[PDB]
Design a protein around this nucleic acid. Structure first.
Lengths: 262, 185, 124, 37
RNA sequence: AAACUGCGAAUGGCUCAUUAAAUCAGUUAUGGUUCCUUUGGUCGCUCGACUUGGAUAACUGUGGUAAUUCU
RNA sequence: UGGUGACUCUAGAUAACCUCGGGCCGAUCGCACGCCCGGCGGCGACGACCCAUUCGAACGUCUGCCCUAUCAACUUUCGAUGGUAGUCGCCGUGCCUACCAUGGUGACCACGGGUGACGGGGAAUCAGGGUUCGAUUCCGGAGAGGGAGCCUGAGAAACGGCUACCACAUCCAAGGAAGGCAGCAGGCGCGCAAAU
RNA sequence: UCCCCUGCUCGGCGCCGGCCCGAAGCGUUUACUUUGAAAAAA
């Protein structure tokens, strides 16, 4: 190709977008944004599939530019905006708010939340930047540059920011024993506690995370996000509590629900 | 770059021996006894039985205390006892290999309509099915190759629009009655 | 008689309509025309039948089950705002210009061949 | 906004530097204590 | 309507001629470089007019070649 | 000051430079209206030097491809291998110049030739091992008759952009002018072989 | 089936300079074998 791509096929889409094949040929390619092309969710696919507020690609456009969707407290007009991870999607008309958190499987799910919890947002810093006159900077995972942070902010730790002021409120240190939640790979959405971390120079440092039912799993350091201090999370976790239940017991739960419901 | 499916598979298989006396005799005995039409339907019954037997053999190759083997065996066994080819007493993975063709052909809709007690012969049962008479749980079914389940066994009855189950008279009866009224009036 | 039953009913404050799935039960008779579902939803929800939009009615195999959608608006101008043009053409509210694509493309090319004010008079 | 944010960062940096200085002072005292005992 | 300006025409679509460590695939690096657009930051941090200038469009009018999205 | 496994990293200070083909430091636009004695004001659009971020692209590291010995040695002052100093390039690099040393690969199959060879995810047959195909809807590469050169633009050696060559070819009042369906329909030929 | 027959400098399940535990730092190299990550979809 002589330039950047602008189209995207339906079968080339990620599974968590989680579409069909007989509907169309092209998939909604998201515009460039704070999050990457893969682990992002477009607003069109969310409003058309997860909430069923529209049937076609034009009604969702009318909803999106009628100034009723608040992304991180701000209105967004672009229909293919990448709504990333821990992004607060608020609708001031119906009075319902959402937060995009992975469930036990590898997908996004709707999560209706209280409005007052929507005032804050968790994000993970990527690197430490010194400005042109000795101004320290933070670059979070959603590319939100923060001027003059706390001097105790490390390279791989999370912070709690306010949506209105935009400054930092409090932070969690990346330490052993804090509550964790993976954000990529085979293990996705599992709620675990950090137990071990080995360092490999010039490579990826794999950490060991222990699940809340005694299970153990290991992922890379880049797929690690801290949500709480100790064992108590700072946000309201969805149904299933990130437990990653296997096939036999979810089959038992499904047959029990079918027997009780009839 | 069109939006189609292009997914299909053959449901039968042709035998290696084209002319064998015992095989033709057994196939024609099955066709005559169970009211079939041609050899492709008994070949497709043989093909799906062969697929089930191959899956059971591949599952029985692996050792016990395996979650994949236990899950797939329980799912296959539950589906087979839901269809109506097995029972709760023979609830084992190694009892699958003792199943035959007539156990599958007994669960056909044509045979069940014949043997439930509302049709004279099996060919009359197939003719009655193909002309939109027999329904299962308020759903008109006009095909003979409908594998009924155990929970839907006691809901085989004539449709509401058929003259056999109570409905409007057919074309021959109405035409003959019109001829009789015209001749007598 | 003919009765309908709603299913998956929901309201939409942010688009000023209500979505529903309509299950038409017509044993014996054929598929009822859409004005019957419109007036039945009018006298079911106590609404003027000018804001009842129904479509997508497919008759099931078996003679008497019909599944279709339905939009219940709260106003006529609000229904005029967020609606495709072909449904308003079906209800006799919108009219389309009757010109085929080949004439429009040829007229565009003929206007492309000439510059200035003569584009107004080269394509009538 | 630039002026008030710089003043707030200067206050926070002064507090953190004071905490680091007293941490180094008590670590030097601990080193002297273990050297004596 | 027209025309100046800005943006896009480098995407999509078709084919397999050349290409036998070339292409491609898995794993790595840019601490050896550019990056339209979106998002966030910076945008009185420099110590020295209550709004400046003339050219072209569109338009009017005069023409040539047999001919062009010509002038 | 801060960080990497590691800097000639980021930041700090000193002394200067700072391209007239010229880095920035707003002579732009809409809606709603105004408080306090002409100053002072909220919400947006556009543009903008730089630094991250997003879609990328580009050059790299290790490993993995069909046949042929009736191809046994191949490459080299026309760079082949390496050193140094530079030009150019967005960057590393014989990519290329100037001077040096004679290096580099090869029976573990280099080099030369052929392919009715685009590569891969895949497809058919199929006890176990294998064999054959993959032009073909997804990813990557290449081309728009075939070579060569370039303007604009962030992004092209672009062809539904331009400039010449050869082969074919259209109009012509004979001086000149306009082109490239391996895009969608369609036609000719080629054929056993393929639709409005 | 169950635990045992590689060494020293910073420091925490604890007791009153004395003992166990953790750990910044390294240990003769290959294949084979088992686990774990990541490995686009259809």
């Amino acid at each position: 190709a002589r330039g950047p791509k602008k189209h995207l096929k339906r079968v080339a889409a990620p599974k968590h977008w989680m579409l069909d094949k007989l509907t169309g040929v092209f998939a909604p390619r998201p515009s460039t944004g704070p999050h990457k092309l893969r682990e992002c969710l477009p607003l069109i696919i969310f409003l058309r599939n997860r909430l069923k507020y529209a049937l076609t690609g034009d009604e969702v456009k009318k909803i999106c530019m009628q100034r009723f969707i608040k992304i991180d407290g701000k209105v967004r007009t672009d229909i293919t905006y990448p709504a990333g991870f821990m992004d607060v999607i608020s609708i001031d008309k119906t009075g319902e708010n959402f937060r995009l958190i992975y469930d036990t499987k590898g997908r996004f799910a709707v999560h209706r939340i209280t409005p007052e919890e929507a005032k804050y947002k968790l994000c993970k810093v990527r690197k430490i930047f010194v400005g042109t006159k000795g101004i320290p900077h933070l670059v979070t995972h959603d590319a939100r540059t923060i001027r003059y942070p706390d001097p105790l902010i490390k390279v791989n730790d999370t912070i709690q920011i306010d949506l209105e002021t935009g400054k930092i409120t409090d932070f969690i240190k990346f330490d052993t024993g804090n509550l964790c939640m993976v954000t990529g790979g085979a293990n996705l959405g599992r709620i675990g506690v950090i137990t071990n971390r080995e360092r490999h120079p010039g490579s990826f440092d794999v950490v060991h995370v222990k699940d809340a039912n005694g299970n153990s799993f290991a992922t890379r350091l880049s797929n690690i996000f801290v949500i709480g201090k100790g064992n108590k999370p700072w946000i309201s976790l969805p149904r299933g509590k990130g437990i990653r239940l296997t096939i036999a017991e979810e089959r038992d739960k499904r047959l029990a629900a079918k027997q009780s419901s009839g | 770059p069109v939006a189609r499916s292009w997914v299909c598979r053959k449901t039968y298989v042709t035998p290696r021996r084209p002319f064998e006396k015992s095989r033709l005799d057994q196939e024609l005995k099955l066709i005559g006894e169970y009211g079939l039409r041609n050899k492709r339907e008994v070949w497709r019954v043989k093909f799906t039985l062969a697929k089930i037997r191959k899956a059971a053999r591949e599952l029985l190759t692996l050792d016990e205390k395996d979650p994949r083997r236990l899950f797939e065996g329980n799912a296959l066994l539950r589906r087979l006892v839901r269809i109506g080819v097995l029972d709760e007493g023979k609830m084992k993975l190694d009892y699958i290999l003792g199943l035959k063709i007539e156990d599958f052909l007994e669960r056909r809709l044509q045979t069940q309509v014949f043997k439930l007690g509302l049709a004279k012969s099996i060919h009359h049962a197939r003719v009655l099915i193909r002309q939109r008479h027999i329904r299962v749980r308020k759903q008109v079914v006009n095909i003979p190759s409908f594998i009924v389940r155990l929970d839907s066994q006691k809901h085989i009855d004539f449709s509401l629009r058929s003259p056999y189950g109570g409905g409007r008279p057919g074309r021959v009866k109405r035409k003959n009655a019109k001829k009789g009224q015209g001749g007598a009036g | 008689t003919v009765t309908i039953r709603t299913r998956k009913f929901m309201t939409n404050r942010l688009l000023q309509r209500k979505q529903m799935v309509i299950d038409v039960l017509h044993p014996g008779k054929a598929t009822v025309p859409k004005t019957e579902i419109r007036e039945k939803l009018a006298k079911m929800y106590k609404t003027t039948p000018d804001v009842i939009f129904v479509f997508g009615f497919r008759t099931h195999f078996g003679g008497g089950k019909t599944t279709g959608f339905g939009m219940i608006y709260d106003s006529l101008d609000y229904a005029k705002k967020n609606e495709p043009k072909h449904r308003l053409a079906r209800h006799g509210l919108y009219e389309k210009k009757k010109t085929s694509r080949k004439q429009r493309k040829e007229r565009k090319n003929r206007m492309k061949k000439v510059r200035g004010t003569a584009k107004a008079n080269v394509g009538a | 906004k630039n002026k008030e944010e710089a003043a707030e960062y200067a206050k926070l940096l002064a507090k953190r530097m004071k905490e680091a200085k007293e941490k180094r002072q008590e670590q030097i005292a601990k080193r002297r204590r273990l050297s004596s005992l």
